[PDB]
Design a protein around this nucleic acid. Sequence first.
RNA 1: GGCCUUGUUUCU
RNA 2: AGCAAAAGCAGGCC
Lengths: 194, 511, 539
Amino acid sequence: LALTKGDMANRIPLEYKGIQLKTNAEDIGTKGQMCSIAAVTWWNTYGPIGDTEGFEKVYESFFLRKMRLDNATWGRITFGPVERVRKRVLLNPLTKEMPPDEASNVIMEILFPKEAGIPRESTWIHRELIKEKREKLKGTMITPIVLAYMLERELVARRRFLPVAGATSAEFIEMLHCLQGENWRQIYHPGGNK
Amino acid sequence: QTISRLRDISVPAGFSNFEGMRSYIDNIDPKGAIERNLARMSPLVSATPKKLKWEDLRPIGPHIYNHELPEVPYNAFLLMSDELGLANMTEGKSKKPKTLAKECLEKYSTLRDQTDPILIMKSEKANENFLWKLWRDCVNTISNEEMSNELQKTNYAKWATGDGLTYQKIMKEVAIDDETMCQEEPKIPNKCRVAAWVQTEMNLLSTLTSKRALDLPEIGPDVAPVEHVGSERRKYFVNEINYCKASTVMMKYVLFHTSLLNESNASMGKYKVIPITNRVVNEKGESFDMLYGLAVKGQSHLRGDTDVVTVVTFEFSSTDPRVDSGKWPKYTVFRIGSLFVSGREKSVYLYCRVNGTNKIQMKWGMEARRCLLQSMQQMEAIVEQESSIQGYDMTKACFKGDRVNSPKTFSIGTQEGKLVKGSFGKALRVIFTKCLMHYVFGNAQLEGFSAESRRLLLLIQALKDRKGPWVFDLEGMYSGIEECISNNPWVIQSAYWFNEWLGFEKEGSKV
Amino acid sequence: MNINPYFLFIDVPIQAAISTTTGHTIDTVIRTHEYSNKGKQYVSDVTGCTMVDPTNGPLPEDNEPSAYAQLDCVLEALDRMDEEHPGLFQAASQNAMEALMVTTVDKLTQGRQTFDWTVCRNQPAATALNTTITSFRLNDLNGADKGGLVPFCQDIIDSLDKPEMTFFSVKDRITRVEYIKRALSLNATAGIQIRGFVLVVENLAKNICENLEGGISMTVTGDNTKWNECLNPRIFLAMTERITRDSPIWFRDFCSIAPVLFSNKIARLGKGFMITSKTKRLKAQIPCPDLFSIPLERYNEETRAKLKKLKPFFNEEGTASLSPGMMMGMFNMLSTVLGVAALGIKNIGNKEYLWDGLQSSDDFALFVNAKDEETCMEGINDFYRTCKLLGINMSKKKSYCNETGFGVAGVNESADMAIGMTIIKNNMINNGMGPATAQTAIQLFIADYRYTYKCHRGDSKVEGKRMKIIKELWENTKGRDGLLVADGGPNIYNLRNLHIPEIVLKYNLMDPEYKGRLLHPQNPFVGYDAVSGTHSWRT
RNA sequence: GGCCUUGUUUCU
RNA sequence: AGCAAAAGCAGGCC
C-alpha cells in the first residue's frame, strides 16, 4: 500500500478528522511511503475529477452481456427429473474467432505500430480491426496490460466439459445455472443481439 | 551403459538377460497359461459372499450398557443448555465489547465485588487460590478506563494458563546414555457409559425461546420464478428457526471464535480478556447486550498449525452443580452470588474451566455459520423428495397444505416407548441442532464413526427396500464401527439412538 | 420427553441425506514388504541393498492381500487385450512417435510440488531446469541450446555413466554412486529427473486408454486395498515392452527406462519420532536417517515391533529401498490400463458365467451374467482368484454385492468479489448445489466480506474508524444506490446477475462526479473477470 | 532479564 | 496442569 512519488502524494491529505492517511518514511523494495485504506475511500469522496472516455470504450462485451440480461425473457419453472450430456461447449459467446498465437501477435502489433513487424496476411486481413480500435483507444491512457487483457478476453475461445441439456448456444451456456439444476428446468430466452 | 546393466537387473524371476527377457517377451505362446493356474490355485483362496438377514444386526457396541463405567462427561468448550447472561438495554449502536462488559456488569453491581467465594466441585488438579485472585484482578481490569483488554504479570495465570510447562530441546548425542529417554504411549481412551443428560440437551436446544440473534445481509431484488421460490423457502426456514435457542448458541460461538483468533493475532503475549458477547434483539425491536463470560489467553507465539494456547473460560451459570456430578469433573465451581431475576431464586456460580485450542479449531470456528448451509440443503433434499411425490412447488403443502399433500407428521421423539409427532418446524430445528452438535464436540472419532456407519446406513436402507444385499464381512464392518466408539458424548448417544432405532425397525418390520 | 435425531429415517429415505450419511511411511513400507516376504529375493550389486521381488513367486494360501503375480499371465492378458485392439499398440506407438519429436523442455513449470536433486526437499519446479543447466552444462550436457527434450534425455541417460561430477550447490564434487542415488530417492514426492519420462509413459497410457470402453446378474461395487502398496514395476516394464514390440529400436531403447528407475526406487524415511524423559525434562529428535543407530530397546512396543520386521531391508545410509510399490499414485492411468486389462479376460475355464463389468479408476463395478445363483458364486470366486493372479487385491470390507438394480480470498477488493462470485457460480453449475444454498451463500459471503474490510452500510449502527467516512459519503451523495460494497451501499446480486463485475453493473445509476473521482486515470496507488480502477490494488 | 513487526481487532 | 489418537505443544532469539 505504497504510493507513486510526487504530486501524487499531495492530492490526498495527510490527516483527515483525526484519521491517518499516509506515512513519512521510505521503503526498500520500491522505495516509497505507505498509505491507508481511508485514503482509498477519501479519493472516492473528495478527490479530483477524472474523465469518462475509453472506460466506456474498452469494455463493451460485458455491457453486451448486461443488455442481454436486461432484454431477456423468462418462462415456466419446470419440475421432475432431467437427463444431461457431458459435452464440451463454448462457454461465453465470443466476439470474433481467431487463433490465439497470431491473435497475441496482432494485438502486439496494435500496441507497438513501429515494432509491429512485417505485414503478414493475417495482419493484412486484420488491419481494419487494428485501425477501427486504434481510433477508439485515442481518448485515454489506459495501461497496455489492461488493454491486452481485455483484448485477449474478447478474442479467445473457452472450451470445457460440463453436463448440459436443452440448448447449445453459448448464451445458454452462460445462463445454464438459471436454466436447470438436477430436478428442475426454467424456460428462458435471452434478449437483444446475440 | 550402466543403465543397460540395471535394465538387465530388473529382470523378473525366471530369466537371465534382458535380451533373453525380450526374446522371451515376443516369442512365447499365448494359450495354456491361466486355466492351469486355476487348477493350480488353492481351494481356500476365495471370497464366498453371504446373504444379509435381520438377525445378525446386533446392538452396536453393547459395552456401553455395563454399569461399571464412568459417566459421559461434558467436555466441550462452552455452555449450551445452561446459558445465563444479564438483562440489558441499549439502542443498537454496536459498541466496543470492552464497553459492553463495562456496561452490563456495571448494571448488575450486586456481583461487583462478591469477594466471598464458596468452593463447590473442585477437581483433581484445579486449585482455589489462583483462580479466585485471577478472576478478581481480571474483573478489576474491566471496570476502568486505563486501556482496553490486557492483564498484569502475576503468578495466578502463570499457574492456571501455564508458563514454562514445556521441556528444553537439547542435542541428541547426549540423549543416548541416559536410559530415561523413552518413547511415549498413545492416549488411552477410557471407555464410558451411555448418556442420560445429552438427551435433555437435545430436548433443550430445540425449544422456542423469546430471543433471536441472527442477522443476514440483504440481497438484490428478484423477478425470476426460481428466485421467487428460492427466497420463499429461505424466508420460511429462517422464520422457522429464528426463535430457537441454538441460534443464540451459534452466535455466541461465532463471535467468540472470531474475537479469539483476531485478538490472538493482534496480541501475542499481552494476556487479553475477551467478553463473550452476543447482541440479541427482542420481538419488538429493543436490543439486548448480553454479556455472559470472560476469557484469558496466555502467550501465543504460534509457529505452525498445532500450537496451542490455554483458554480459561469463566461463565456465569444458573442450574446447580449438584444433580449429575459426573458431568462436571473439570468444573471448578466458585460461588459468588444469587439473583432474583424475575420471580424466584437463581444462583451465581462461575465455572472456571481450563481449556485450550489450536489454530485449526479457531479458523474452523470462525466458519461455524456454515451449518446453516448443510441444514438448508438437507431440507432441500427432503422437499425435493416430497415434490417428487407430488409434482410441483410443494413446500406450500408443508406450511399450510396444498391440494393433495397434507402437512405430514414427522416422528421425532418417543414417550414410554410410543412415538410422538413433532411439527415440521420442530424437525427442522432438530436437523439444525444436529448439524450444530456435530460441530460443537466434533473431533476425529466422529468423522471415523460417521464415515464407517454410512455403509451400514446404506445397507439398512437397501434392506428396507427389499433389495437383499450380500456382504462379505459383517464382522469387518462392525469392527470398523466399534473400534472408535469410546469417549465423545455425541458418538455414544448416537449409538444408543441407533440401537433403539434398530429395535423399532425390528419390531415394525414384521411384515 | 425422550428424543432421537435418527427418527428422521422413519419417513425420509437415507439416500437423500447424503450430506450427513514418519509412522505412516514405515507402516506403508511394512505393508508393502510384508505381502511378499516369502517371494523371490535377488540382491543387487550397484547398491547391494536387499531388494525383494514379487514377480513369479508361489501362490498364496489365504485371503489376505499379497503382491504375488506370474509374468506370462499378465503378458497374455495384454496380448488378448491387443487382440481386441487391432493396431492400437501400433496407434499408440505412432502417436508417441509423432509426439516425441516435438518434445521440448517446456513442460517443467507446472510443478507446484516437485522434487529437485540438490536442496533435498520440495520445490515448485521453479529453479528445477535452471539447476539442471547450471549443474549439467559445465559437465558438457547440451540440450537447452536446441531446447528439445530429446537431447536432454539422451545426455541425461548418458549422465549416470560419468564417474565424477562437479557442480555448485558453494561448489561440490562427488563420485558416481551418490550422483545416481541422490537422483533416485523420493521423499509422496516424484523426480524431476524422471518426470518427463513418466510423462511420456503417461501420455502413452492416455493414447492407449482414451479411446477405450434367464441369466441371473448379481453385481458388486468396491475399491481395492493397498492399491499403491501392492503393485510392482516389473509388470510395468513387461507391459511397455509388449506395447513397443512393433516399434522401432530407439523406442524400445527409450520406453524401457521408466520402470527401470521405478525398479530401484529408494524411499526416504519421513521426519522421525521422539522420546521422553518425564523427570529430567530434556528432549531430542531422532531424524530420518539414523533410526536403528540407537538403543533399540529404548523405544516403545510399537516402534520396536515395527523395526523388528523392517530391519532386513534397511540401507545403512538412512533410506530404505522398496522394489515393489507405487506411493499414492503417479502411474494412475497406466495402472488403470493394467486394471482394465485385468477386467478384459471375461472368462476362465468356460463355465456357465460371463462378465460385462465396466472400467473405472482403482474402484470398479462388475456385471456377472451366470446361470443360477451358485454359478454367480463360483464366478465371483474365480474372478477374485484371477484378479489375485495379477498382484491385485479386492477389498472385501468396503463392498456390497447385491441383486441387480474457504471463505473470502483476500488479495484486493474488486477481484476478491469476482473470485468469490465465480467460485459460487461454478459450484452451482457442476454438482447441482440447490439454489437456496447458493442464495444464502451469497449472504454469508457478503457478511464475510463486510467483516473482512469493515465496509458496512452507512445507514447502519456499526462504528469504526473506517465506517465514519462511508457515513460521510452517504450523507454527501445523491447517488441513492450507485456505490460498490467496499464503499458502503447495498449489494444487488441474486441468482442471475453473476457473470458481471461490480462497476460494469453499477455504472448506469452511478453519480457523475463520484465516478469521475473513482475512474481517475492518475490514480496514484494502483501501480473470472475484472475491471481496472482504484480498488484494484495490491500490497 | 530485553525484542518478536505501535495500536484499537467497534458483525443489523 | 489442559488439548489432541502422523509424536507434539504448553516459546524463540539474545
